[PDB]
Assembly symmetry: D2
Homo-oligomer: 120 residues x 4
């Protein structure tokens, strides 16, 4: 299932609980960037996916402020969970930093992360 401890290709750790009615709640620890230790995350997932082989849509957010650091930024991940022997969460993400209006054009990074439950 979605609940568990996940790792992406960068070595970041995503610990999440999927509530029965669609909540995602957990913590995120990034291996890269202006980040240290765990950050709060919240999100949502489709708690009644299609029964045709399709993945389960989901998304979550981290604001990059915790007791250690504040990067004045937030990332959202949007993607789908694909169950099976080697379960996967495939995502695309948007990292927005707070900027002035004149620099808003360069406020948002985009990328893609794939998660599995295999520990580095």
């Amino acid at each position: 299932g979605i609940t568990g401890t996940w790792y992406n290709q960068l070595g970041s750790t995503f610990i999440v609980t999927a509530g029965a009615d669609g909540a995602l709640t957990g913590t995120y620890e990034s291996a890269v960037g202006n980040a240290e230790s765990r950050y709060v995350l919240t999100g949502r997932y489709d708690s009644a996916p299609a029964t045709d082989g399709s993945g389960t849509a989901l998304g979550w957010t981290v604001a990059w402020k915790n007791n250690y650091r504040n990067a004045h930024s937030a990332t959202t991940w949007s993607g789908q969970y694909v169950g099976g022997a080697e379960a996967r969460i495939n995502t695309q993400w948007l990292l927005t930093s707070g900027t002035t209006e004149a620099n808003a054009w360069k406020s948002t990074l985009v990328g893609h992360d794939t998660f599995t439950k295999v520990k580095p």
Copy 2:
């Protein structure tokens, strides 16, 4: 926080009602004017609760999974952006809408776009 909290409408005519908590939480409901959607959907997200004071926006994001007690689109949108405060407050965003797909169709699972929200009263 008082800044973010409130009712907002985007260029499509969608409605965003949000509460910003002291801990960095965003909670509320979203009603989309378009797509496979009807009525209100739960949203949850996070914002920078101690932002820069140097004329920068406040970073934030939130998610809606497009399932409520009336419809299920088997999809989820995330919005990533910044709140720009002041008397004409704005939330400027980019978003990713992922649909659940089969593996063969995963290449076409995700739409991208941008929404600008205006605060109402």
Copy 3:
């Protein structure tokens, strides 16, 4: 084609000069108002030369590599979007700006945004 061909300016104040060829080619120059850029840069792209006639936009895209004979930013932007014709013609786009990075920094190589171009005369 006559529609796309011309001079266009975006919300940043950047300048796009383009010629649309009968074969679907776009050629021209781009001058950015912002970033690690000065003067004009070559652009090349493609457009749908036989678009739908049913009130839909004309799909198109183009690339600028941010090297000219005056500066090199070691980066490239692609714009993907549609031309909306008529007396107030627009090109509405989303873009991806990739910088060359080391492998360890590749996760932060790409910016995303959106530009709207207005045709001038």
Copy 4:
């Protein structure tokens, strides 16, 4: 170098020539979507990359019209070439379909393709 025949994770074939001063010219054949046979592509790349280990920035466009089909759409790929024993081109892409104004919100797909010169 960039010039050559490349394949992505979907099995699409990208045949390209990198001109000395920054042009990319070639053809693209997609394994998926509303597409058959080869399509014209053009793009640009950094013809004098940094000498610090960094990749070479590049991008290209395909409009999905050829003598067989017209999907009334265009894709742009933005990314970097990474040389070495197993050269790679890592990209993110935007696929815009012509739409009415009211449907423009759903006009643009986003994804990511990785290319190598290894034939399936």
